[PDB]
C-alpha cells in the first residue's frame, strides 16, 4: 500500500556541560506511486526512532499530485528560502532526471519522466520542502478552468 524511501540522516549534536549530547535527524518520503506523496522529518535520541517519527509525520501532510501520463501538467519554479527548485514536464522515454533528493520525492509520487534543476541553496532539507510546495501548486486544465468559470 505505502512505500517509503529514506532521504538522509544526520548527527545534529547539542552541547552540554561535560560533553556533547546529540539527536538524530531523519527525512523520509512516503508514496503510493499513484499520485500521493508525503514528507516528514523525524528527531529522536536513537537512529531508528528517528525514522519511525519520519514515517509517521510523512503519512500526515500528504500531497495530491496530478499525474498526466506519468509527468507534470506544467513547469513551475518554487523558492523555499534560498533554495530554488525547477520542474518541467517530460515526454515519456526520458526518465526522472533529478538530484538525489527530488528523484526520491517524484519517484514515490509516481512520476516516470520529468526534468529538474536545483538552484541557489542545494540544501537537501530545503530542496525537499521546496519540491513539496512545488507539487502543492500543480493545477490541471480542469482546475484552472474551474477557477475562471465564474
Amino acid at each position: 500500500d505505502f512505500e517509503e524511501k529514506m532521504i538522509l540522516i544526520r548527527r545534529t549534536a547539542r552541547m552540554q556541560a561535560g560533553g556533547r549530547r546529540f539527536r538524530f535527524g531523519a527525512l523520509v518520503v512516503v508514496g503510493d506511486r499513484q499520485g500521493r506523496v508525503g514528507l516528514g522529518f523525524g528527531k529522536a535520541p536513537e537512529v531508528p526512532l528517528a525514522v519511525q517519527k519520519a514515517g509517521y509525520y510523512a503519512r500526515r501532510n500528504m500531497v495530491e499530485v496530478p499525474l498526466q501520463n506519468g509527468t507534470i501538467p506544467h513547469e513551475i519554479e518554487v523558492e523555499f528560502g534560498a533554495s530554488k527548485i525547477v520542474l518541467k514536464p517530460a515526454a515519456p522515454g526520458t526518465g526522472v532526471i533529478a538530484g538525489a533528493v527530488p528523484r526520491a520525492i517524484l519517484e514515490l509520487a509516481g512520476v516516470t519522466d520529468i526534468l529538474t534543476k536545483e538552484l541557489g541553496s542545494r540544501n537537501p532539507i530545503n530542496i525537499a520542502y521546496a519540491t513539496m510546495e512545488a507539487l502543492r501548486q500543480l493545477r490541471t486544465k480542469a482546475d484552472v478552468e474551474r477557477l475562471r468559470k465564474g
Binding site: 522515454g93 526520458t94 526518465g95 526522472v96 532526471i97 516516470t112
Partner: peptide, 9 residues
Amino acid sequence: EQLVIEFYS
C-alpha cells in the same frame, strides 16, 4: 530500462 536511462543522464 528507466534505471539504465537514469544511469546515463
